[PDB]
Design an enzyme around this catalytic site. Structure first.
Site, PDB file in Angstrom:
ATOM      1  N   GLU A 209      -6.098  19.776 -34.831  1.00  0.00           N
ATOM      2  CA  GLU A 209      -4.646  19.947 -34.736  1.00  0.00           C
ATOM      3  C   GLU A 209      -4.116  21.144 -35.501  1.00  0.00           C
ATOM      4  OE1 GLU A 209      -6.158  17.121 -36.276  1.00  0.00           O
ATOM      5  OE2 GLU A 209      -5.452  15.400 -35.169  1.00  0.00           O
TER       6      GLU A 209
ATOM      7  N   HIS B 200      16.936  18.339 -22.719  1.00  0.00           N
ATOM      8  CA  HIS B 200      17.384  17.018 -23.239  1.00  0.00           C
ATOM      9  C   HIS B 200      16.567  16.568 -24.444  1.00  0.00           C
ATOM     10  CE1 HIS B 200      14.373  14.869 -20.549  1.00  0.00           C
ATOM     11  NE2 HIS B 200      14.396  14.013 -21.575  1.00  0.00           N
TER      12      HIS B 200
ATOM     13  N   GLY C 180       9.121   9.062 -23.120  1.00  0.00           N
ATOM     14  CA  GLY C 180       8.118   9.500 -24.107  1.00  0.00           C
ATOM     15  C   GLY C 180       7.353  10.688 -23.551  1.00  0.00           C
TER      16      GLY C 180
ATOM     17  N   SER D 249       5.575   9.132 -14.434  1.00  0.00           N
ATOM     18  CA  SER D 249       5.730   9.546 -15.869  1.00  0.00           C
ATOM     19  C   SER D 249       6.774   8.526 -16.382  1.00  0.00           C
ATOM     20  CB  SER D 249       6.121  10.961 -16.068  1.00  0.00           C
ATOM     21  OG  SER D 249       7.156  11.403 -15.248  1.00  0.00           O
TER      22      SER D 249
ATOM     23  N   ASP E 104      17.303  21.526 -16.922  1.00  0.00           N
ATOM     24  CA  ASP E 104      16.718  20.820 -18.084  1.00  0.00           C
ATOM     25  C   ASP E 104      15.442  21.549 -18.570  1.00  0.00           C
ATOM     26  OD1 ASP E 104      16.324  18.873 -20.090  1.00  0.00           O
ATOM     27  OD2 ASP E 104      15.711  17.303 -18.672  1.00  0.00           O
TER      28      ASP E 104
ATOM     29  N   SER F 204       8.892  12.926 -21.503  1.00  0.00           N
ATOM     30  CA  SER F 204       9.876  14.008 -21.304  1.00  0.00           C
ATOM     31  C   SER F 204       9.505  15.306 -21.980  1.00  0.00           C
ATOM     32  CB  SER F 204      11.233  13.552 -21.912  1.00  0.00           C
ATOM     33  OG  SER F 204      11.837  12.799 -20.849  1.00  0.00           O
ATOM     34  N   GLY F 205       9.687  16.409 -21.296  1.00  0.00           N
ATOM     35  CA  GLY F 205       9.434  17.753 -21.788  1.00  0.00           C
ATOM     36  C   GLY F 205       8.019  18.230 -21.487  1.00  0.00           C
TER      37      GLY F 205
END
Ligand code: 688
Ligand code: CA
Ligand code: CA
Length: 223
Positions: free
Chosen positions: A62, A40, A175, A172, A84, A177-178
């Site tokens: 980074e 998603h 923001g 959770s 998902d 997600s994943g």
């Protein structure tokens, strides 16, 4: 993440931020060239940000790498959120160090009651909005399937698991997600969906990674 704590810079070295001009989803580094996230979260023009702590400040550790290829699971259903999961190949290999590390895939599924670490830059408010700049962490147990299914009748498939607290207050959220769900050193889940955040009897729903290891391994080997 609602009711969690500040992880501390680079304490979760496998955590990735997916950016398309702003942070929109988390992900997990599984090897120097591959990231796992939620289907998603699929978007065109993704930039993968590794070694991140404060997503609004360049702190020095980074690595920013564009995605060369995105592969959504072949049976991903956007209506039900079944399957998902998506794989993202990096343009060039990330440089693994103490701040950027990969997380291993499970050799078996985990039992209800197992403690996991969930992490992300999502909303920290139950009902309201406040986005952190630093990575937030949360320890939460995997819940029994029966409690998961009772909270969301007719919506839980064999590819999902619930983790959290039935009493609410810790979860959770948007923001996140994943993002990763790590239990006993292996990636067991991906932040997928929920009903509100940290609401009583509405735990977080996560993609059950242990069902996808052969698809992940075969897909990466051929791409
Ligand atoms: N509490 C959490 N752990 C949590 C984790 C991630 C989130 O993004 C999240 O918050 C939300 C927000 C919404 C929304 O505003 O529309 C949708 C959603 O789930 C969806 C979105 C789309 C479809 C469905 C759905 N379809 C059928 C089963 N679920 C659920 N999750 C909560
Ligand atoms: Ca910082
Ligand atoms: Ca930064």
């Amino acid at each position: 993440i609602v009711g969690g704590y500040t992880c501390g810079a680079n304490t979760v070295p496998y955590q990735v931020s997916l950016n398309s001009g702003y942070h929109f989803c988390g992900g997990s580094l599984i090897n120097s060239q591959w990231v796992v996230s939620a289907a998603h979260c699929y978007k065109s023009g993704i930039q993968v940000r590794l070694g991140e702590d404060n997503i609004n400040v360049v702190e020095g550790n980074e690595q920013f790498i564009s995605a060369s290829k995105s592969i959504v699971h072949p049976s991903y259903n956007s209506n039900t959120l079944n399957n998902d999961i998506m794989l993202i190949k990096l343009k060039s290999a990330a440089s693994l160090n103490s701040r950027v590390a990969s997380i291993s895939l499970p050799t078996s599924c985990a039992s209800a009651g197992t403690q996991c670490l969930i992490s992300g830059w999502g909303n920290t408010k139950s009902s309201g909005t406040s986005y952190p700049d630093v990575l937030k962490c949360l320890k939460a147990p995997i819940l029994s399937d029966s409690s998961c299914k009772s909270a969301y009748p007719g919506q839980i498939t064999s590819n999902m698991f619930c983790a959290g607290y039935l009493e609410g207050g810790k979860d959770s959220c948007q923001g996140d997600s994943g993002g990763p769900v790590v239990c006993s050193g292996k990636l067991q889940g991906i932040v997928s969906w929920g009903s509100g955040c940290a609401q009583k009897n509405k735990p977080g729903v996560y993609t059950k990674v242990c069902n996808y290891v052969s698809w992940i391994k075969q897909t990466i080997a051929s791409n």
